[PDB]
UniProtKB/Swiss-Prot annotation:
Residues 187-233 are annotated as: C2HC. It comes from the Viruses. Residues 1-273 form the CoV Nsp2 N-terminal domain. LRR repeats lie at residues 362-386, 514-536. Residues 275-505 form the CoV Nsp2 middle domain. Enhances mRNA repression of the 4EHP-GYF2 complex in the host, thereby inhibiting the antiviral response and facilitating SARS-CoV-2 replication. Possibly acts in cooperation with nsp1, which induces ribosome stalling on host mRNA, triggering mRNA repression by the host 4EHP-GYF2 complex which is enhanced by nsp2. Zn(2+) 3 binds at residues 187, 190, 199, 233. Changing residue 507 to V: In strain: Omicron/EG.5.1. Interacts with host GIGYF2. It comes from Severe acute respiratory syndrome coronavirus 2. Changing residue 373 to K: In strain: Omicron/BQ.1.1. The chain holds residues 184 to 818 of 7096 of the full protein. This is Non-structural protein 2.
Amino acid sequence: RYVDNNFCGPDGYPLECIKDLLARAGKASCTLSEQLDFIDTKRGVYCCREHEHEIAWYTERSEKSYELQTPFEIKLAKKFDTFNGECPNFVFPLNSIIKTIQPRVEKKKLDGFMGRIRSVYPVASPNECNQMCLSTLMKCDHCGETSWQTGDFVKATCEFCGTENLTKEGATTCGYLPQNAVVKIYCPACHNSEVGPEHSLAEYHNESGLKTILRKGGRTIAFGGCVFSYVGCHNKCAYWVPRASANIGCNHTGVVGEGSEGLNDNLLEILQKEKVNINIVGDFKLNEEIAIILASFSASTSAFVETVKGLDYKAFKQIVESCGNFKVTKGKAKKGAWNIGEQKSILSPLYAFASEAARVVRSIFSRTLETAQNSVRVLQKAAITILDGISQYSLRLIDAMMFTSDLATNNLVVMAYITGGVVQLTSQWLTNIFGTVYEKLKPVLDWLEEKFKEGVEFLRDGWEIVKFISTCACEIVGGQIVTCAKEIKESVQTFFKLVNKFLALCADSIIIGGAKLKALNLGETFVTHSKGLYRKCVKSREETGLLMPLKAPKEIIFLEGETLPTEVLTEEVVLKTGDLQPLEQPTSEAVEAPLVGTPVCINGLMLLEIKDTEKYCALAPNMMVTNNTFTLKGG
Ligand SMILES: [Zn+2]
Ligand SMILES: [Zn+2]
Ligand SMILES: [Zn+2]
C-alpha cells in the first residue's frame, strides 16, 4: 500500500486507515497541512500498526482536508525524492503538471447536452470538439502481437489487422490533448428500444455496463494519465471529457500503468521543453513520422489531402511552427531532440496525434496484408479494400503523397496499392514519350505483368519504378531512353535496361534528306538521336507557301514533331545540293545562338541556314526549326 507524501493512494484518493486515524484524533475538520503535521507526529509511515505506508510519490495538492482529497486536487506528481525503487502504478505520470477544467457558468438557459458541454468547452456545437487519441498497450487476440491499439477506454482497434479488442490491463496513454478534447462512447441506452434517448444518468451507467470507479463524488474513469467524467449524450453517443489531465510538455499526457516509468522517461527527454525541437536528420522525406506530425495540424482529412500536395521541407516547417510549440531544424541528429529520419514504429505514445487526418495516416501506414504468394493484383485489391475501409479519401491522400511530393514507406498495404498501378503508369509514360503504346512496346507492360506474379517480392522494385517514373525527366534519344543525372537504383536500372533493349531491337535505318540516321521504327513514327519523336511529312511545292524555285523537287519533306521558338528571316528558300551530315548537337546545343536564318531545300529536305555559320537545322511543316541538326561535307 504505497502512498504519496500526502498519504494518499495511487488512485489519488485518501485511504480509509488514514481517515480513521484523523477521525478518532478529531482532525477531520482540519486542513491538509494541519492533518499532515499530526500524521507525521504519529510516525507518518508507521502511523498504522499493520501497514508500512512507504512514501513512493511526491505530490502538490490543495489544502482541502485529507478526507476531501481527490485526483482533481493534484497539481504536480513526481517520484518521491528518497524513494529508492521502481515506481508503482499511479493515476498520473511522473514529473507531470496536472491541469483541470474549471466549468464555465452560462448566462442563458440551454438544453441538457448543449448546456453541459458548453460549460466544459466554449463551443457552438459538438462538431467543434476533437475526439481524443486513447491507446492501450495490449496483446491482440486475433493475431498474437502486442502493440498500442487505438480507441477509447472500453475497446481499441489493432492497427496491424483492423480488428477490435477490449481494453486489458497494461500501459495506457492519451495523446496530445486537443482543443475541446472529448471522448465519444457508444451509448447502448440510446440504442436500447426500451430506454431510448433522454435517459437518466443512472440509466446511462446501468446500460453502459463499463467498469467505472465509484466514489462518493461520482463515477470517474482513470485512463492514460487523464481522469474522465461523463457530460452528456448526442447523436446516440455519450461524451466523456478529461476533467483532469497530466501535461508533460507539448500538451502530451504521458503514460500510466505497468511499464509507464520507462516510457515516460523517453517522452520527457523529448517533450519536456519550452519548445519542442524537431530535427530532420538527412534528406527531408514524407515518411510516416512526417505525415503524422503534419496531419496533426489539419482540420479534416480532405484538408490534409490538399495540404500534402507538393509538400517540401519549407511548407512542413511553416505549418508546424505556426502553432508556436515547435522549432524545426535539419542536419545532424542532436541529443535530446525529436530526431526524424531513422524509421521507428508509429504506434507509440509518441506521435499520438488525435486529428482526423492523423488517424487516417496512422491507419494507412500501419495495416498489414495477409500475404500468401498472392499476385500484385490480388494484393492491390486487398490493399484497396483496406484503404477504402479506413477513409474515402485514403486513396486520394496516397496519390497526392506519391505523385506530388516524395513519399517513403515500408508498409505493404500502401506499396501494394501503388505497385499495382505501375502498369497503367508505364502505359501513360510510354504514351507521353512515343504518343501511344505500340506492339513493339507492349512487351514492356508484359514484363510488369509477369513480375506481378512475384507478389510481395516485387513490391519494392515496383515501388522504386513508380517513384522514379512519377517524377522522372525522361527523354528518348535514338533507340535509348536517358534520364537526368541522378543515381539509379538497381531495381530501376533493370526496368530501363529491358525497356531500352526492346527499343534497340527497333532501331531501324531511315533516310532524311538523303542522310542515314539510326532511328526507332515503331510503326508510322520514328525517333532519331535528335532527342524527339518525329513523323515524315511530305507536301507538294505549292502547298508550303515557300518562294521555291521551279527546279526544286515537286515534293518537299518536313519533320513533324517538337520544334523550337525560332524565327525565319525571309520566305525566300534557296535550292541547294550537298551531302547532309547529322550532328551530335541537336536542340540548338551548338555554340551558335542567332536562332534565325534563311530556308534552304537540300535533297528535298527543308532546313534553316543558320545566320553567320554553316550549320543547318531541319524545319517542321509549320516552318519552325526542329531539333535535328545537320551540316554539309565541304560546305
Ligand atoms: Zn494503514
Ligand atoms: Zn493484430
Ligand atoms: Zn445516451
